Amino acid sequence: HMASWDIFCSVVDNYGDIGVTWRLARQLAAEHGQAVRLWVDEPQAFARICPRADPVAHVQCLDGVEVRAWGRPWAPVAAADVVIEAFACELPEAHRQAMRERKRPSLWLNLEYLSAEEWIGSCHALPSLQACGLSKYFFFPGFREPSGGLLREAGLLERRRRFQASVSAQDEFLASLGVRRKVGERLISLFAYENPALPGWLEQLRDARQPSLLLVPEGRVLADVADWLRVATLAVGDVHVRDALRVQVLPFMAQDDYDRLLWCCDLNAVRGEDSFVRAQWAGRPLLWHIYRQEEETHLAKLEAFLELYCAGLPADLAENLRTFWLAWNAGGGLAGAWEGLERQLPEWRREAQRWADEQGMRPDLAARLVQFYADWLLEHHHHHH
Numbered sequence: 001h002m003a004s005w006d007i008f009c010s011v012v013d014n015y016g017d018i019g020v021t022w023r024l025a026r027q028l029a030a031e032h033g034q035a036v037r038l039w040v041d042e043p044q045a046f047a048r049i050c051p052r053a054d055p056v057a058h059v060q061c062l063d064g065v066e067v068r069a070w071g072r073p074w075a076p077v078a079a080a081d082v083v084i085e086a087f088a089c090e091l092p093e094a095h096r097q098a099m100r101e102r103k104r105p106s107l108w109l110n111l112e113y114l115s116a117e118e119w120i121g122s123c124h125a126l127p128s129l130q131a132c133g134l135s136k137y138f139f140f141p142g143f144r145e146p147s148g149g150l151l152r153e154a155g156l157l158e159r160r161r162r163f164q165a166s167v168s169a170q171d172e173f174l175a176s177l178g179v180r181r182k183v184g185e186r187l188i189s190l191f192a193y194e195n196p197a198l199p200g201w202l203e204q205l206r207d208a209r210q211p212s213l214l215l216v217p218e219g220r221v222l223a224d225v226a227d228w229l230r231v232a233t234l235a236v237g238d239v240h241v242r243d244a245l246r247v248q249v250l251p252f253m254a255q256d257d258y259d260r261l262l263w264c265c266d267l268n269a270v271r272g273e274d275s276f277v278r279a280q281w282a283g284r285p286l287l288w289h290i291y292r293q294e295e296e297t298h299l300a301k302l303e304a305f306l307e308l309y310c311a312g313l314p315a316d317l318a319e320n321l322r323t324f325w326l327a328w329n330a331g332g333g334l335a336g337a338w339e340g341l342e343r344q345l346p347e348w349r350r351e352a353q354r355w356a357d358e359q360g361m362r363p364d365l366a367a368r369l370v371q372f373y374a375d376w377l378l379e380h381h382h383h384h385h
């Protein structure tokens with residue numbers, strides 16, 4: 001059996017929305033043998049998370065996914081069995097006509113942003129009748145049931161465990177990036193936005209008794225790192241030493257290589273949606289920088305995740321983790337919040353592995369999506385399940 005899938009992605013900003021839809025598109029084609037067309041309105045954003053891509057090509061097949069440019073004006077084509085509107089990006093007019101014209105009209109899904117709030121359970125899989133007659137279904141990724149789950153490839157944790165149990169595989173990957181760990185040096189990856197709390201944290205890493213290696217992929221936070229280092233230029237391959245802190249700049253690497261980087265580090269500073277979850281699959285301590293929103297509505301998503309993630313932690317670790325995460329997202333941290341958290345990183349690592357294993361036994365999002373279409377198809381013909 002093979003169904004066809006349309007996935008529409010409007011790169012509003014950054015690389016998370018194309019990062020998530022690309023990850024889903026690959027999984028649908030590789031693990032489920034589905035026919036997948038991914039529509040992106042900005043090919044240059046997709047080309048940086050998938051270096052094999054050609055930005056000027058109007059159509060190309062990568063990892064079994066037909067990646068097509070979302071054109072203006074929109075070239076009319078036939079609609080697939082399932083049309084995934086990612087993050088309410090609005091489908092083309094003529095494509096909704098093509099969805100409605102089919103003998104079996106397309107299943108219309110709206111892929112929502114991931115949230116840990118409890119209320120998304122009451123809205124997951126909710127149908128909404130549109131004016132044209134078709135219904136749209138809201139799909140909420142989640143950390144608890146009911147929800148749409150989390151993106152996770154098949155055998156992901158099995159590969160991660162073998163990678164982290166092999167000193168040679170970790171050193172071999174870091175050597176490809178030009179990274180050489182020192183004995184006793186803690187490894188921290190930095191992926192965030194502009195953050196006024198960064199200099200306060202880099203000062204504590206500098207003055208610490210134990211040394212740290214700060215690996216910074218090229219991106220937004222690099223100007224802040226360069227400002228703290230009192231340097232004008234910060235290029236890929238540069239290394240600067242500030243007492244106990246080694247800062248090394250990494251390239252913006254392929255998505256799967258970013259996973260291996262997350263797997264090497266003892267603490268991963270991540271952000272947004274995809275890298276926030278990928279750091280959890282790494283089974284390592286992490287730091288989440290969520291971008292500020294209207295008023296302060298990003299505070300709700302942060303506290304919702306903190307309540308769930310800290311539920312299994314010891315009181316001391318949970319309290320220090322909370323205060324640090326809030327300060328890291330407050331645009332102005334706390335001068336001593338790192339000392340209390342650094343001393344508990346070995347125990348935090350153990351709890352992060354338990355968190356990954358327990359989340360890893362929930363069915364993945366791509367499987368629930370494929371199962372949603374199966375139950376929806378059988379129901380459409382009033383058949384049993």
Ligand SMILES: Cc1cn([C@H]2C[C@H](O)[C@@H](COP(=O)(O)OP(=O)(O)O[C@H]3O[C@@H](C)[C@H](O)[C@@H](O)[C@H]3O)O2)c(=O)[nH]c1=O
Binds near residue numbers: 014020253272
């Ligand atoms: C650092 C790095 C990241 N990546 C990938 C990881 C991610 O899939 C992707 C980045 O996506 P995210 O983790 O979600 O962070 P982001 O900041 O890039 O995107 C986010 O911006 C917010 C404003 C939105 O609210 C979110 O919905 C989301 O789109 O880039 C690489 O491929 N190589 C790299 O070196």
